[PDB]
Structure 1
Amino acid sequence: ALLSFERKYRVPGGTLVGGNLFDFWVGPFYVGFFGVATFFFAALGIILIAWSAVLQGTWNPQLISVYPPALEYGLGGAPLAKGGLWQIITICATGAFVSWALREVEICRKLGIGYHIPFAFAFAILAYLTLVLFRPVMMGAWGYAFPYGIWTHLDWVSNTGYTYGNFHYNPAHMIAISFFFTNALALALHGALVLSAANPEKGKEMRTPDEDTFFRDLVGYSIGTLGIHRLGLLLSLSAVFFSALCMIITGTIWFDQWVDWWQWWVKLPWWANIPGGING
């Protein structure tokens, strides 16, 4: 139940609420106040979903789906079987996520480390809260949010997307996708760099950060080892920031076909009317 180096770290302290009340582990898992909060929220949430599954008439995980209040409920409550359960599961989900980040903060304090992880996690939570809370409230209805279901959530992705034609033309979506792809590239390369240093050619010794060499050799730059960890962090957080930007604005500041937004550049007076080319 303990890693060979673990015991020296399992000291008391660091909790945010409760002093020493929930200061303990269960197996490898740290508990804490927010470990308890997490359990209560995640458990309720699951129970409510299983209930909503009974009300829907299925136990298939490929079919079980919990849709929000239909569009005509606005931002009020809806009968439990008609989007009320979603409303409560969403309160549960949010409770579980925030609790989990706060439990992460608590671990950080015990371990005397930096708060970077729960900070990073907060961006994902914010993406979620954009889709299920922020956008709906700004749009006037819960029914704009995605439903909880393996394939039904995907239907919502497609139908929301095609409401604005090819969603490719959302400018923020483009920036976001760029970060996603770039970040995957940085992951591939960081992973492969470190491994090629630690796992050199048969019989040779382990190489070193001097790695900088390989990359300079390859592209004339190297960001360094503090740098790449700063990069991955920035890249992936930035992808999620733009992800949320690109949807916070859609259905609110921009609601027509995203392709048409690009006309502002073509229609600029200096060239709007010159003939030739695709738009002349």
Structure 2
Amino acid sequence: ALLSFERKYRVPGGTLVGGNLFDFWVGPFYVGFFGVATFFFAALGIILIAWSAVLQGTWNPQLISVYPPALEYGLGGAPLAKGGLWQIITICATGAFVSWALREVEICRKLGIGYHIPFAFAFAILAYLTLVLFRPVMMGAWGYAFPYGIWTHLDWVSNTGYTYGNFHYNPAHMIAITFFFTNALALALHGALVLSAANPEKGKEMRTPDHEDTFFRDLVGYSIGTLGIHRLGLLLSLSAVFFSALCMIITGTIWFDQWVDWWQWWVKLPWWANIPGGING
């Protein structure tokens, strides 16, 4: 029921709202006020998705889809069978994510640690809201937001990207991809380095962080450090998501053309705009 060290930490306090009414644990989970909120929102959303599966006439989990209302419904409600179930699932998911972050804040306060984790999750929630709320609001239709299906929100990504040509040419998209790839690379390097220090070759003494720094200075001539690597991982992930949200917020609202054409401003700079040869000239 508890870890071998857990008991000395399960003290009252740290609650944002309430204090005794919802200050306890169910199994391993801490149940706050936001715990109750999150559980209700999640259960309502999941069973609504099951209901929409019943309405759609398919019991394939991969084929289940909850489309938003068509474009002619604007920013208004829709019949449950047509577009309203998506809106209820959307408000449920938004509430679930926000209450999950708040429950994390309560857990942080009880444990006496920093609030970095809910902050990063807030970045993720903001990207989600950009995709479901902010961008469709600026484009005046819930139909622009993605459907809630496993293989049908991919169709949303495909259609939305191809509306603007090759979506690779969105510059903020390029930056966000660079951050994502760099973050995966850094995660692999960090896991590998820690495991290699903690698991030396064969019956060898466990390595110190000096060995980690020496390994990476030998390899690439720099070592960001034990604290620096965790700072870097957090910042890479958050910057990736930030530039993802930035790239989507400007698409369809500030930019409407093919994204490749955006690069013409570099090739048309007057000093070299009309020099023959190369590719564009």
**What TM-score range do you get, normalising by the shorter chain?**
over 0.9
1-structure distance, mates of 2:25, 2:161: 44
2-structure distance, mates of 1:25, 1:192: 35
Alpha-carbon shift at residue 202 of structure 1 (Å): 0.9
Gaps of 5+ in 2: none
1-structure distance, mates of 2:268, 2:255: 18
Alpha-carbon shift at residue 77 of structure 1 (Å): 1.1
Alpha-carbon shift at residue 119 of structure 1 (Å): 0.5
Alpha-carbon shift at residue 53 of structure 1 (Å): 1.6
Deviations 1:170-211 (A, max 9, x none): 101100000010000100101111111111121221111111
Alpha-carbon shift at residue 103 of structure 1 (Å): 0.4
Query: Which sits farther off after the overlay, 184-193 or 76-85?
Result: 76-85
Alpha-carbon shift at residue 79 of structure 1 (Å): 1.4
Report 1:223-234 matches (<5 A): 223-234=224-235
1-structure distance, mates of 2:108, 2:77: 38
SS in 2 for 1:154: helix
2-structure distance, mates of 1:168, 1:85: 33
Deviations 1:63-93 (A, max 9, x none): 1100001011111111111111111110000
1:141 counterpart residue number: 141
2:219 counterpart residue number: 218
1:25 counterpart residue number: 25
2-structure distance, mates of 1:2, 1:109: 20
Deviations 1:116-156 (A, max 9, x none): 00101111111110000000001111000000000111111
Report 1:176-187 matches (<5 A): 176-187=176-187
SS in 2 for 1:226: helix
Alpha-carbon shift at residue 54 of structure 1 (Å): 1.6
2-structure distance, mates of 1:18, 1:73: 40
Deviations 1:218-239 (A, max 9, x none): 1111111010000000001111
1:110 counterpart residue number: 110
1-structure distance, mates of 2:27, 2:56: 36
Alpha-carbon shift at residue 47 of structure 1 (Å): 2.0
1-structure distance, mates of 2:257, 2:142: 21
Using the size of structure 1 for normalisation, the TM-score is 0.98
2-structure distance, mates of 1:203, 1:55: 61
Deviations 1:5-57 (A, max 9, x none): 00000111111111111111111111110110001111111122122122211
2:156 counterpart residue number: 156
Alignment size in residue pairs: 280
SS in 2 for 1:30: strand
Aligned-residue identity in percent: 100
2-structure distance, mates of 1:63, 1:279: 45
1-structure distance, mates of 2:190, 2:53: 43
SS in 2 for 1:202: coil
Gaps of 5+ in 1: none
1-structure distance, mates of 2:215, 2:45: 50
SS in 2 for 1:66: coil
SS in 1 for 2:226: coil
CA-based RMSD of the aligned residues comes to 0.8
2-structure distance, mates of 1:93, 1:38: 9
SS in 2 for 1:97: helix
Using the size of structure 2 for normalisation, the TM-score is 0.98
Alpha-carbon shift at residue 59 of structure 1 (Å): 2.1
1-structure distance, mates of 2:158, 2:90: 21
2-structure distance, mates of 1:224, 1:135: 39
Superposition misfits of 4+ residues, deviation over 6 angstroms: none
